[PDB]
Design a protein around this nucleic acid. Structure first.
Ligand SMILES: [Mg+2]
Ligand SMILES: [Mg+2]
Ligand SMILES: [Mg+2]
Ligand SMILES: [Mg+2]
Ligand SMILES: [Mg+2]
Ligand SMILES: [Mg+2]
Ligand SMILES: [Mg+2]
Ligand SMILES: [Mg+2]
Ligand SMILES: [Mg+2]
Ligand SMILES: [Mg+2]
Ligand SMILES: [Mg+2]
Ligand SMILES: [Mg+2]
Ligand SMILES: [Mg+2]
Ligand SMILES: [Mg+2]
Ligand SMILES: [Mg+2]
Ligand SMILES: [Mg+2]
Ligand SMILES: [Mg+2]
Ligand SMILES: [Mg+2]
Ligand SMILES: [Mg+2]
Ligand SMILES: [Mg+2]
Ligand SMILES: [Mg+2]
Ligand SMILES: [Mg+2]
Ligand SMILES: [Mg+2]
Ligand SMILES: [Mg+2]
Ligand SMILES: [Mg+2]
Ligand SMILES: [Mg+2]
Ligand SMILES: [Mg+2]
Ligand SMILES: [Mg+2]
Ligand SMILES: [Mg+2]
Ligand SMILES: [Mg+2]
Ligand SMILES: [Mg+2]
Ligand SMILES: [Mg+2]
Ligand SMILES: [Mg+2]
Ligand SMILES: [Mg+2]
Ligand SMILES: [Mg+2]
Ligand SMILES: [Mg+2]
Ligand SMILES: [Mg+2]
Ligand SMILES: [Mg+2]
Ligand SMILES: [Mg+2]
Ligand SMILES: [Mg+2]
Ligand SMILES: [Mg+2]
Ligand SMILES: [Mg+2]
Ligand SMILES: [Mg+2]
Ligand SMILES: [Mg+2]
Ligand SMILES: [Mg+2]
Ligand SMILES: [Mg+2]
Ligand SMILES: [Mg+2]
Ligand SMILES: [Mg+2]
Ligand SMILES: [Mg+2]
Ligand SMILES: [Mg+2]
Ligand SMILES: [Mg+2]
Ligand SMILES: [Mg+2]
Ligand SMILES: [Mg+2]
Ligand SMILES: [Mg+2]
Ligand SMILES: [Mg+2]
Ligand SMILES: [Mg+2]
Ligand SMILES: [Mg+2]
Ligand SMILES: [Mg+2]
Ligand SMILES: [Mg+2]
Ligand SMILES: [Mg+2]
Ligand SMILES: [Mg+2]
Ligand SMILES: [Mg+2]
Ligand SMILES: [Mg+2]
Ligand SMILES: [Mg+2]
Ligand SMILES: [Mg+2]
Ligand SMILES: [Mg+2]
Ligand SMILES: [Mg+2]
Ligand SMILES: [Mg+2]
Ligand SMILES: [Mg+2]
Ligand SMILES: [Mg+2]
Ligand SMILES: [Mg+2]
Ligand SMILES: [Mg+2]
Ligand SMILES: [Mg+2]
Ligand SMILES: [Mg+2]
Ligand SMILES: [Mg+2]
Ligand SMILES: [Mg+2]
Ligand SMILES: [Mg+2]
Ligand SMILES: [Mg+2]
Ligand SMILES: [Mg+2]
Ligand SMILES: [Mg+2]
Ligand SMILES: [Mg+2]
Ligand SMILES: [Mg+2]
Ligand SMILES: [Mg+2]
Ligand SMILES: [Mg+2]
Ligand SMILES: [Mg+2]
Ligand SMILES: [Mg+2]
Ligand SMILES: [Mg+2]
Ligand SMILES: [Mg+2]
Ligand SMILES: [Mg+2]
Ligand SMILES: [Mg+2]
Ligand SMILES: [Mg+2]
Ligand SMILES: [Mg+2]
Ligand SMILES: [Mg+2]
Ligand SMILES: [Mg+2]
Ligand SMILES: [Mg+2]
Ligand SMILES: [Mg+2]
Ligand SMILES: [Mg+2]
Ligand SMILES: [Mg+2]
Ligand SMILES: [Mg+2]
Ligand SMILES: [Mg+2]
Ligand SMILES: [Mg+2]
Ligand SMILES: [Mg+2]
Ligand SMILES: [Mg+2]
Ligand SMILES: [Mg+2]
Ligand SMILES: [Mg+2]
Ligand SMILES: [Mg+2]
Ligand SMILES: [Mg+2]
Ligand SMILES: [Mg+2]
Ligand SMILES: [Mg+2]
Ligand SMILES: [Mg+2]
Ligand SMILES: [Mg+2]
Ligand SMILES: [Mg+2]
Ligand SMILES: [Mg+2]
Ligand SMILES: [Mg+2]
Ligand SMILES: [Mg+2]
Ligand SMILES: [Mg+2]
Ligand SMILES: [Mg+2]
Ligand SMILES: [Mg+2]
Ligand SMILES: [Mg+2]
Ligand SMILES: [Mg+2]
Ligand SMILES: [Mg+2]
Ligand SMILES: [Mg+2]
Ligand SMILES: [Mg+2]
Ligand SMILES: [Mg+2]
Ligand SMILES: [Mg+2]
Ligand SMILES: [Mg+2]
Ligand SMILES: [Mg+2]
Ligand SMILES: [Mg+2]
Ligand SMILES: [Mg+2]
Ligand SMILES: [Mg+2]
Ligand SMILES: [Mg+2]
Ligand SMILES: [Mg+2]
Ligand SMILES: [Mg+2]
Ligand SMILES: [Mg+2]
Ligand SMILES: [Mg+2]
Ligand SMILES: [Mg+2]
Ligand SMILES: [Mg+2]
Ligand SMILES: [Mg+2]
Ligand SMILES: [Mg+2]
Ligand SMILES: [Mg+2]
Ligand SMILES: [Mg+2]
Ligand SMILES: [Mg+2]
Ligand SMILES: [Mg+2]
Ligand SMILES: [Mg+2]
Ligand SMILES: [Mg+2]
Ligand SMILES: [Mg+2]
Ligand SMILES: [Mg+2]
Ligand SMILES: [Mg+2]
Ligand SMILES: [Mg+2]
Ligand SMILES: [Mg+2]
Ligand SMILES: [Mg+2]
Ligand SMILES: [Mg+2]
Ligand SMILES: [Mg+2]
Ligand SMILES: [Mg+2]
Ligand SMILES: [Mg+2]
Ligand SMILES: [Mg+2]
Ligand SMILES: [Mg+2]
Ligand SMILES: [Mg+2]
Ligand SMILES: [Mg+2]
Ligand SMILES: [Mg+2]
Ligand SMILES: [Mg+2]
Ligand SMILES: [Mg+2]
Ligand SMILES: [Mg+2]
Ligand SMILES: [Mg+2]
Ligand SMILES: [Mg+2]
Ligand SMILES: [Mg+2]
Ligand SMILES: [Mg+2]
Ligand SMILES: [Mg+2]
Ligand SMILES: [Mg+2]
Ligand SMILES: [Mg+2]
Ligand SMILES: [Mg+2]
Ligand SMILES: [Mg+2]
Ligand SMILES: [Mg+2]
Ligand SMILES: [Mg+2]
Ligand SMILES: [Mg+2]
Ligand SMILES: [Mg+2]
Ligand SMILES: [Mg+2]
Ligand SMILES: [Mg+2]
Ligand SMILES: [Mg+2]
Ligand SMILES: [Mg+2]
Ligand SMILES: [Mg+2]
Ligand SMILES: [Mg+2]
Ligand SMILES: [Mg+2]
Ligand SMILES: [Mg+2]
Ligand SMILES: [Mg+2]
Ligand SMILES: [Mg+2]
Ligand SMILES: [Mg+2]
Ligand SMILES: [Mg+2]
Ligand SMILES: [Mg+2]
Ligand SMILES: [Mg+2]
Ligand SMILES: [Mg+2]
Ligand SMILES: [Mg+2]
Ligand SMILES: [Mg+2]
Ligand SMILES: [Mg+2]
Ligand SMILES: [Mg+2]
Ligand SMILES: [Mg+2]
Ligand SMILES: [Mg+2]
Ligand SMILES: [Mg+2]
Ligand SMILES: [Mg+2]
Ligand SMILES: [Mg+2]
Ligand SMILES: [Mg+2]
Ligand SMILES: [Mg+2]
Ligand SMILES: [Mg+2]
Ligand SMILES: [Mg+2]
Ligand SMILES: [Mg+2]
Ligand SMILES: [Mg+2]
Ligand SMILES: [Mg+2]
Ligand SMILES: [Mg+2]
Ligand SMILES: [Mg+2]
Ligand SMILES: [Mg+2]
Ligand SMILES: [Mg+2]
Ligand SMILES: [Mg+2]
Ligand SMILES: [Mg+2]
Ligand SMILES: [Mg+2]
Ligand SMILES: [Mg+2]
Ligand SMILES: [Mg+2]
Ligand SMILES: [Mg+2]
Ligand SMILES: [Mg+2]
Ligand SMILES: [Mg+2]
Ligand SMILES: [Mg+2]
Ligand SMILES: [Mg+2]
Ligand SMILES: [Mg+2]
Ligand SMILES: [Mg+2]
Ligand SMILES: [Mg+2]
Ligand SMILES: [Mg+2]
Ligand SMILES: [Mg+2]
Lengths: 97, 147
RNA sequence: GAGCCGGUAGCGGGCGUGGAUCCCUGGAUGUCCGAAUGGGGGAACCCGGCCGGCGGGAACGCCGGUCACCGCGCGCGCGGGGGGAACCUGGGGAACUGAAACAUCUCAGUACCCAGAGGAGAGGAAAGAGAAAUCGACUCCCUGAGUAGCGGCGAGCGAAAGGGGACCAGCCUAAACCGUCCGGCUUGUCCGGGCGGGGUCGUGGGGCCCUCGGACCGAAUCCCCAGCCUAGCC
RNA sequence: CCCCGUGGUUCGUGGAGCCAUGGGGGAAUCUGGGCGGACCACCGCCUAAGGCUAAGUACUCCGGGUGACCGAUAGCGCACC
RNA sequence: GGAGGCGUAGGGAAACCGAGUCCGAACAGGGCGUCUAGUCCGCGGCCGUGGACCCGAAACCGGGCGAGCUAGCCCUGGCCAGGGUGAAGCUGGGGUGAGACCCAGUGGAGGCCCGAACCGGUGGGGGAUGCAAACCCCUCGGAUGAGCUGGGGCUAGGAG
RNA sequence: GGCGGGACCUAAGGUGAAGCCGAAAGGCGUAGCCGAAGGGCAGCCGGUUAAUAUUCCGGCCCUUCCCGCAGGUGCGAUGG
RNA sequence: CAGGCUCUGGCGACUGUUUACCAAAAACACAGCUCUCUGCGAACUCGUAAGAGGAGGUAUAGGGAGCGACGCUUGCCCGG
RNA sequence: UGGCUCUUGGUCGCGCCUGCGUAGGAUAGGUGGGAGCCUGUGAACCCCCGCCUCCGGGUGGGGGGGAGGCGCCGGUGAAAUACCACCCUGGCGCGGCUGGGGGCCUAACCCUCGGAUGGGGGGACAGCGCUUGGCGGGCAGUUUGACUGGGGCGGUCGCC
RNA sequence: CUGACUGCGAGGCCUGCAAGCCGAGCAGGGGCGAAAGCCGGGCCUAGUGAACCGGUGGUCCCGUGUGGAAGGGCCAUCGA
């Protein structure tokens, strides 16, 4: 329930719309909305732990972008990353986006 | 999700082959243990380039060995030694054949490659295989003579 | 340009045609709190580190400099923080009320909360409009028009095209290819990462390869000046 | 791009396209792709998934100009420490 | 400044026709029309829309403000005159095969007794523009406990 | 300097490097820090003023830090 | 300054607690009885979450509900 | 969000086998091609074993013998026969790709371990994202008519 | 035998509106009667329900760039 670190995907606000009755297309009288409320649609956030230059990097990334992360690791094959802390490596990878 | 294998893996594929596996089996097993890389465009170009370079050095080996075989077979190495009747007092060895082929004709050849199990102890005309490259054998006719 | 030491007279003393008081501009000084930022803290108080000075000064004390955190850029530089009457954008977002009850609907994306920006903000150079064989970024006013439509087709809600006006402006990248620096090891016509060149289009444009041809525009950036504002004068 | 849940637009599921997107699947590079209100053919318009852009517009803490505005129970809550 | 608005044509769901048109097979009959207005500004009456003649709710909603009163908990301290009853145990004795148990002494237990401080508030009287927006007198409950109390803390609005 | 408080310590709690969570605001959180009427720490009697005193004065005690002297010892800590 | 006493019923076993400011009770609580949930990252409660309480506990334990010392007991109906 | 294996289910890719009327040599899948194929890739025929048995057989085999036998012809019915395709009926065995299940694995993910590029446990379950139906006074918004010899209760409510 | 008609409807009853009711006659194609004529259900007065939303049949009127389609309109009837 947070932000994708790759796509920036954020929880959104959508409506829950309860309906009763038969649709007009099906020979019915029509759909009567019997209630609307607010609700949140979160991304499908998951954890992705990858090894980069000897350090363990964790990404809280939406599922729909798990492959993108690996692209970063590929694109990280030509960076001076030896010795740096995990946070600095993560900043480098994100800057590669 | 297509991947490029790094090692031969049982009932799955050969080293260097591009196979098709579920994304979980690649992300959480093959790629961590360094058994396969993602079949992206970049490393696919890299694999194509490595295959090209390997075939290039193989063609270089075969062409160089074909030139070396064109050098031989059109010559007879004549080695004079000391001998009584058909039996030689000393022995002509691969090292001696190489010393001869470098002193006359001027070819530096690898003596270890010459197929010669036992030292030549008799006189006459012999034919020996050199084999600088497998499937590319060279027939050398040497005339072990006396005086 | 002859008075002056504020509102404020008095006691007690002074200054000014050698141009004071007063007004405008720049500079200096600016205790302590406050984003408050050496550290703490019950704001305006308390307690330190380091360098330098003072007192007889080592203990004690005063003085001057300096020491928070975060972000970006090869220990050091630049930036950030907080405030601002309304106006602006974005992220969240009610209810009374109306429907002569009430639930869809309305009030309304209003009130309020939060983050951000600036003298404005948003928007903006067509993957547009919609039938015009047509227009040509965006913003704003008038009109279209309470029309087209939406709606327990209830209560109510409410466009756009077009036309008239204000204004007027268009641009830079990514990618092909080319160069260079760096490092990865799976050694190269290799992959990746910086930088430079090239390139910016819809009558499609561009790269590359041939083939012919070799100065006029001009900034939104920078410099100078007119004009203007912050005292006044005849 | 298609499907599922929604928001925006006059559009409250309506014949519901257009813009946007939380989830699932998921392409191509001009013979490419989006739109013209389901959809299909024809005919047109346009060129997405990178960014910037004055001026005309909004406001009045402040300075100034002007009132068929107030005149001390009025006018800002306060003409006055 | 003529963009636009109203009027110059209506009838019809519309296609469309047009001084007519619609229903209809009808040249039948009828509906609505045609035999001409209008429009702009000022003023006044009433209406729709806004709070719409003025004052008045009980309430609903959003964001903040409060546990220095009070409720509970947490941390740390403090207070409870004096007297009374006399559990277990211990010691000695009696008892028995050994015991249980009986008696005396010692002992000092308890949401034990009486009763000030302290915490309360039973009944009555007073007070009623009170001394006091909860007080005064008399009487009464608890008072080593689920006791009282100081200071430092935490939990709040559909929540504590 | 000796009474109370600070230049000491911790308690609930508060904050909060690390870290975790949340549309924003923010919410948690070991260490550390702050946090007292708890722990720790060296002054008792009398005189004096119109008004202050364990504070000024008198008599008799005491603590801390700095420097020096002598003696002594493996000295030395936010760690045990 | 300092108990009037006795006999006999109802209700509550008892000491306690409560409507600050018209009700102190027969109401609440209480030890005790039963049913029920929970195998531990417990159930359950607070929170969007993180994280807490439960508990630095482990079924002789923790949650919920009812009844309410103690004595003697607590029947029949499972169709809704 | 994965690996392996077992097991059944569905579909294709092959090996395939399987198909029973009067009539007709016998048990005729269909539409064709079709007037000849077959044997040292060892014949008419003899016995032993699987297989389906419409109780007649069909067919895979093996050994002996070791070179003959069936079509077109005609009988014959709707269709008539060797041999070569394509495709149905239903079955089986390998496989593709999956839908369920059972079993195992570790590496996602979860817990834990003075040790953490690790060890141990759970384990593709749980958690969590989107969606489907359901339970849902725990909570939220509201509804709960008028007449009436006061209201309630009763009675009444439109039409003749 | 199907007038329990189709296209209309002069003129009135009743009446706040909206409704409810009676209706000669003209035309279309009919039924019965030799004919004059009668017939637009029933001796009469109750046997009922406005819109909105939707179903079915017909019509072929609109069809969002064009041709179609989707969906609607118009006529008839259904769901109180
Ligand atoms: Mg829903
Ligand atoms: Mg429908
Ligand atoms: Mg329909
Ligand atoms: Mg509806
Ligand atoms: Mg997660
Ligand atoms: Mg993962
Ligand atoms: Mg997706
Ligand atoms: Mg996907
Ligand atoms: Mg003065
Ligand atoms: Mg004087
Ligand atoms: Mg003077
Ligand atoms: Mg100045
Ligand atoms: Mg300061
Ligand atoms: Mg400070
Ligand atoms: Mg300092
Ligand atoms: Mg601070
Ligand atoms: Mg110094
Ligand atoms: Mg000094
Ligand atoms: Mg000094
Ligand atoms: Mg200083
Ligand atoms: Mg700012
Ligand atoms: Mg907004
Ligand atoms: Mg806003
Ligand atoms: Mg935001
Ligand atoms: Mg709300
Ligand atoms: Mg209102
Ligand atoms: Mg109204
Ligand atoms: Mg109302
Ligand atoms: Mg009302
Ligand atoms: Mg409402
Ligand atoms: Mg309103
Ligand atoms: Mg709205
Ligand atoms: Mg919103
Ligand atoms: Mg406002
Ligand atoms: Mg700001
Ligand atoms: Mg401006
Ligand atoms: Mg601007
Ligand atoms: Mg701008
Ligand atoms: Mg912009
Ligand atoms: Mg462009
Ligand atoms: Mg108009
Ligand atoms: Mg309507
Ligand atoms: Mg609206
Ligand atoms: Mg316009
Ligand atoms: Mg215009
Ligand atoms: Mg202008
Ligand atoms: Mg222009
Ligand atoms: Mg480069
Ligand atoms: Mg290099
Ligand atoms: Mg690269
Ligand atoms: Mg390169
Ligand atoms: Mg081109
Ligand atoms: Mg420019
Ligand atoms: Mg959608
Ligand atoms: Mg919608
Ligand atoms: Mg909507
Ligand atoms: Mg509709
Ligand atoms: Mg729509
Ligand atoms: Mg379309
Ligand atoms: Mg689309
Ligand atoms: Mg989406
Ligand atoms: Mg094209
Ligand atoms: Mg295409
Ligand atoms: Mg699109
Ligand atoms: Mg369009
Ligand atoms: Mg269209
Ligand atoms: Mg086209
Ligand atoms: Mg277009
Ligand atoms: Mg300009
Ligand atoms: Mg002003
Ligand atoms: Mg005046
Ligand atoms: Mg006055
Ligand atoms: Mg006044
Ligand atoms: Mg006056
Ligand atoms: Mg003022
Ligand atoms: Mg006033
Ligand atoms: Mg108009
Ligand atoms: Mg007609
Ligand atoms: Mg007429
Ligand atoms: Mg007429
Ligand atoms: Mg006139
Ligand atoms: Mg007029
Ligand atoms: Mg009127
Ligand atoms: Mg109003
Ligand atoms: Mg009003
Ligand atoms: Mg009015
Ligand atoms: Mg009011
Ligand atoms: Mg409420
Ligand atoms: Mg309410
Ligand atoms: Mg609130
Ligand atoms: Mg309290
Ligand atoms: Mg209190
Ligand atoms: Mg105590
Ligand atoms: Mg005392
Ligand atoms: Mg006591
Ligand atoms: Mg005592
Ligand atoms: Mg006592
Ligand atoms: Mg006592
Ligand atoms: Mg005694
Ligand atoms: Mg004892
Ligand atoms: Mg004894
Ligand atoms: Mg005793
Ligand atoms: Mg005692
Ligand atoms: Mg005693
Ligand atoms: Mg007691
Ligand atoms: Mg007692
Ligand atoms: Mg007592
Ligand atoms: Mg109290
Ligand atoms: Mg009393
Ligand atoms: Mg009293
Ligand atoms: Mg009394
Ligand atoms: Mg009395
Ligand atoms: Mg009284
Ligand atoms: Mg009284
Ligand atoms: Mg009173
Ligand atoms: Mg009293
Ligand atoms: Mg008294
Ligand atoms: Mg008493
Ligand atoms: Mg008493
Ligand atoms: Mg007591
Ligand atoms: Mg106690
Ligand atoms: Mg206390
Ligand atoms: Mg307190
Ligand atoms: Mg307290
Ligand atoms: Mg609490
Ligand atoms: Mg609280
Ligand atoms: Mg609060
Ligand atoms: Mg409240
Ligand atoms: Mg409230
Ligand atoms: Mg409320
Ligand atoms: Mg409630
Ligand atoms: Mg509550
Ligand atoms: Mg002290
Ligand atoms: Mg000091
Ligand atoms: Mg301290
Ligand atoms: Mg400290
Ligand atoms: Mg401390
Ligand atoms: Mg905090
Ligand atoms: Mg942090
Ligand atoms: Mg803490
Ligand atoms: Mg202390
Ligand atoms: Mg102390
Ligand atoms: Mg002391
Ligand atoms: Mg002393
Ligand atoms: Mg005194
Ligand atoms: Mg002294
Ligand atoms: Mg010494
Ligand atoms: Mg020693
Ligand atoms: Mg040593
Ligand atoms: Mg030592
Ligand atoms: Mg120590
Ligand atoms: Mg020490
Ligand atoms: Mg008695
Ligand atoms: Mg009685
Ligand atoms: Mg009691
Ligand atoms: Mg009791
Ligand atoms: Mg008692
Ligand atoms: Mg009681
Ligand atoms: Mg009371
Ligand atoms: Mg009361
Ligand atoms: Mg009380
Ligand atoms: Mg009260
Ligand atoms: Mg009360
Ligand atoms: Mg009382
Ligand atoms: Mg009471
Ligand atoms: Mg009582
Ligand atoms: Mg009372
Ligand atoms: Mg019991
Ligand atoms: Mg028991
Ligand atoms: Mg839980
Ligand atoms: Mg809860
Ligand atoms: Mg919850
Ligand atoms: Mg926790
Ligand atoms: Mg826990
Ligand atoms: Mg716990
Ligand atoms: Mg614990
Ligand atoms: Mg436990
Ligand atoms: Mg009870
Ligand atoms: Mg009872
Ligand atoms: Mg008894
Ligand atoms: Mg019993
Ligand atoms: Mg039962
Ligand atoms: Mg039952
Ligand atoms: Mg039964
Ligand atoms: Mg799954
Ligand atoms: Mg297992
Ligand atoms: Mg294991
Ligand atoms: Mg494991
Ligand atoms: Mg295991
Ligand atoms: Mg799962
Ligand atoms: Mg319910
Ligand atoms: Mg309710
Ligand atoms: Mg309401
Ligand atoms: Mg409402
Ligand atoms: Mg109702
Ligand atoms: Mg009702
Ligand atoms: Mg009534
Ligand atoms: Mg009555
Ligand atoms: Mg009456
Ligand atoms: Mg009456
Ligand atoms: Mg009734
Ligand atoms: Mg009646
Ligand atoms: Mg009637
Ligand atoms: Mg009439
Ligand atoms: Mg009428
Ligand atoms: Mg009727
Ligand atoms: Mg007739
Ligand atoms: Mg006739
Ligand atoms: Mg006739
Ligand atoms: Mg006749
Ligand atoms: Mg006739
Ligand atoms: Mg008639
Ligand atoms: Mg009848
Ligand atoms: Mg009759
Ligand atoms: Mg009726
Ligand atoms: Mg309605
Ligand atoms: Mg209605
Ligand atoms: Mg309809
Ligand atoms: Mg048409
Ligand atoms: Mg047409
Ligand atoms: Mg069309
Ligand atoms: Mg066509
Ligand atoms: Mg058609
Ligand atoms: Mg149609
Ligand atoms: Mg239709
Ligand atoms: Mg209905």
């Amino acid at each position: 329930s947070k932000v994708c670190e790759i796509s920036g995907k954020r929880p959104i606000v959508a409506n829950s719309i309860q309906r009763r009755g038969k649709a007009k297309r099906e020979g019915g009288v029509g759909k009567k909305t019997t209630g609307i409320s607010k609700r949140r649609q979160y991304p499908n956030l998951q954890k992705v732990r990858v090894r980069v230059a000897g350090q363990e990097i964790t990404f809280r990334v939406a599922a729909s972008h798990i492959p993108k992360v690996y692209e970063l690791v590929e694109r990280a094959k030509g960076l001076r990353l030896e010795g740096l802390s995990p946070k600095e490596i993560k900043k480098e990878l994100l800057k590669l986006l | 999700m297509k991947v490029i294998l790094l090692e031969p893996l049982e009932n799955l594929g050969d080293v260097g082959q591009v196979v098709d596996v579920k994304p979980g089996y690649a992300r959480n097993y093959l790629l961590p243990r360094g058994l396969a890389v993602l079949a992206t465009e970049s490393n696919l170009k890299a694999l194509e380039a490595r295959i090209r370079a390997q075939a290039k050095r193989l063609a270089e080996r075969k062409a160089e060995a074909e030139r070396l075989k064109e050098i031989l077979e059109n010559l007879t190495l004549t080695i004079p030694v000391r001998a009584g009747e058909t039996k030689i007092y000393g022995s002509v060895t691969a090292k001696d054949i190489a010393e001869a082929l470098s002193r006359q004709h001027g070819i530096t050849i690898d003596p270890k490659r010459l197929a010669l199990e036992k030292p030549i102890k008799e006189l006459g005309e012999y034919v020996l295989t050199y084999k600088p490259h497998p499937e590319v054998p060279i027939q050398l006719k040497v005339s072990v003579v006396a005086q």
